[model samples]
Target: DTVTKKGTGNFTAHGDIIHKTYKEEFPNEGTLTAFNTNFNPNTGTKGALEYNDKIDFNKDFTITVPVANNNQGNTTGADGWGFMFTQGNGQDFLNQGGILRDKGMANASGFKIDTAYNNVNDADKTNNLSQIGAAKVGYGTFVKNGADGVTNQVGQNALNTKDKPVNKIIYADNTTNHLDGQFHGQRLNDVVLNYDAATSTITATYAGKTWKATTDDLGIDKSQKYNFLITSSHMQNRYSNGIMRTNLEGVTITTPQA
Candidate 1:
């Protein structure tokens, strides 16, 4: 007997979720649906889209997501967004800030793009950069325990050398900002994430740059299944004007046949 299986799963969103349509004229001459987090100021709002099904880690997969920030030319937007694969439900990091460092997100692995700079004495201080400064990109596993986890700048050492979380900083000077709001002729910024189960490596490509890291180095167990989450946040009294947006229709996930 032949059996049919479902491949794509539905997404459940929480908190402030905005659905908007934008018309693109240049490259892709059509309208695109945008999934936006709250853009209002001082709202302390947060949002997330959680996939209902867990994905097997043994198969190679590719996820393409288009993300952008709509600060309306404001360069001081607070916080940022991230894409994660976690063992827990998406609620753990739902309303959390851009870092997605909440205890609920423990044992999560993914990519994060932070726009604000927090000068605290913790991981935020070391992993974040200003919006006008450089883009701080973090990729790796967030450990199960509350440990701070290990972080290293790209090119400083092999990112896969340790079994802890890792972060990489790109455009380390005040040259480029991620909040420009122009991805491609009014389109959102494109990001592609590829997971190689054989090598235990996850690669992210965004803004004309590519970052790679191994799940082993980040202490991720390959035997487990994970849920995919897209999260963004804005904190009250802390540059609350930041807005994170994604193209829901443009997001795609490809995996091997089960």
Candidate 2:
């Protein structure tokens, strides 16, 4: 299933994704499956996909995803999957720079609930540290070229700074899901994000905790049409090239603008 690919620069690989809906089996169940870049960098093999659309900044949305294992193979630094958004080009925006790493999304924005293979600084990112309780989540705000004559950013900084980065808070941390750092699927996590244009506030809750922030702190616009995405990614050409998979289900979108 790893045969689809589209790239611009040095990053080349097959993009494998599945959009599945269950109306009879599970009755009203929808899902999007994704794989990371697990291929030979020489010829080019990568896997990626996204849904381009305008996302309301003043509304709320919920997503339920199962934390599954990466049985394709054990690829280091190649295990990353969650959500992301782009204020401008959507999926095409990734081609603007070459390979948009976890720390690089140009005007692109969204939350990435990822697994850590081998990290030291952030234990919450370590997937094999219980050996490794390596599941983590973070937010991004990137505009390919620059929205308001500003430089591109990977994550929002602060509402009261020159960077004025997108405010990313760890509302609910499920880092302890897996300590093996290997591909293992077990439980489901419900995530929520809501915003209030009147007050410029957004609240995110998970794992029994709630995080609130202002739109000014996120540096996101309530009127912009953001390219919403439910995809996965893997670090290509790593020491070990394996498959990275993510299981996303019960995905829903709510928009008054729509």
Candidate 3:
């Protein structure tokens, strides 16, 4: 089911899974939550996943869901899964609608990619967002502590599908950022994240040049670096899946208390 593999072990709960908190959750609905979860952090690829699109005043998080190599079966791909924050712990906003979709938590927003796991061939990467899925739900770099399905589920139902049982999130150095869908090959890369307050902005440059874009100026804490992320999702993971951002790069906030 989500049992730890002997060498390439894993950890899954099949139900609701929350992340360790750092600051007060956005909207006050808990820090994070995982729905219909899947975690395999000691088997397949080693590339992890992360998110963007939301911000926090003083909170910083690094979520890597680990995608173990499943006993190193000559297969190579991405690793874990992840999410982002924007003030409140908006986890419940996933799959159902408005980003995060199936992985909701207080409606906090973020994207999750179903990284390549030898599933659906090279055709269908994520669920057809426009055709079926909500708007933007699960899509983006995946490494460990990954998503689950038939092949990657509990009991006999698990491993029913190839990519479904895939471990870790793979941070692509070349094609992952392409509109092709589902990154393949090379199983080791971390999603490096940071924020900016001076410019009130956020920028993400995946695998060096494969992606290098900035967000619109948002009047965040002109005093401190406003926290935010670059999200990818199942619904938002369009065939064109270009880089999207929500930055706090300009303006100033004034409100002093004594």
Candidate 4:
């Protein structure tokens, strides 16, 4: 029931009707296969829900998603889901770009806000990381381009050749970065992500403060094909693996006042 609104309308898809992709295997066997499964994105290790159509982000838009109470009992790992925008193509591990969980990626530019806990990666725990939820924007993909800024600044490609993603932040005057401040297993939480085409910026309001970053340098604006993406997998269970959901009023965003 994800139909396009006539004007500035709010559309919601209940958690029961959303989609979920599993990391282990097909949750419900005998009936649906992996690709043809009928499962909600609310409860699982690898879950994702997306809009039916592509949204022209050049217009103003905002997406609000709710975080669940329990995050699969993985402290410091299950940070939270992210309000993302990508090509809306199949999640083929390659040729896909969006911000999910604690990372952001598009083509060769990427950004990551990781949590370094004692239980996860013991060796790199002593000041060897940013704050538990600190934002770090730089280069080096999921393989490289954008001959901007310094040479080989942040290098290291991940996964396959075509899977490298990049994110470059051209900050506004007063923009600052810090912890995400989402506690483990906290309830009744909603994250509001805003996209402003006029300013070419993406913003998130969390921990009672507004965090902003500019995407004007990434060259993703007016891409003609981009959709809102939501996933519960925190880097494929490395962290941020939580069973998340949104109600009947699932997601409502502000579009350009046409």
**Which model, 2 or 4, shows the larger TM-score?**
2
- TM-score of model 4 vs. true structure: 0.49
Once superposed on the true structure, which residue ranges of model 4 sit more than 4 Å away at CA?
A: 1-44, 69-79, 93-185, 234-241
TM-score of each prediction: 0.67, 0.52, 0.30, 0.49
lDDT of 4 at 126: 25
Error of 3 at 25 (Å): 34
Model 1 lDDT vs. the true structure? Answer: 0.52
Best by TM-score: 1
Model 1 TM: 0.67
What order do candidates take by TM-score, descending?
1, 2, 4, 3
Output the better candidate (1/4) by TM-score: 1
* lDDT tens digits, residue span 1-258, model 4: 222232112332322224343333323212110110233234323334555656676677676654332223223343234344555332521233233221224332222222222222212322123233323211111111133311111222221223113121111112122123433223334455666878866565432324455554434557566655444333332433233444423455556655
Q: Is candidate 2 or candidate 3 better by TM-score?
A: 2
Clashes found in each candidate (C-alpha, N, C closer than 3 A): 0, 36, 89, 11
Give per-residue CA lDDT, model 3, range 40-126, as digits (tens).
333211111122222343333222222211111112222123333333222322222222223323223222333323233223334
Give the candidate number with the greatest lDDT: 1
Which residues of candidate 3, in runs, are more than 4 Å off?
1-82, 94-186, 209-258
Task: State each model's CA lDDT, in order.
Answer: 0.52, 0.39, 0.25, 0.35
Model 2's alpha-carbon lDDT is 0.39
When 2 and 3 are scored with lDDT, the better candidate is 2
Q: Which stretches of candidate 2 lie over 4 Å from their true place?
A: 1-14, 18-32, 41-49, 63-79, 97-103, 117-188, 206-213, 239-249, 256-258
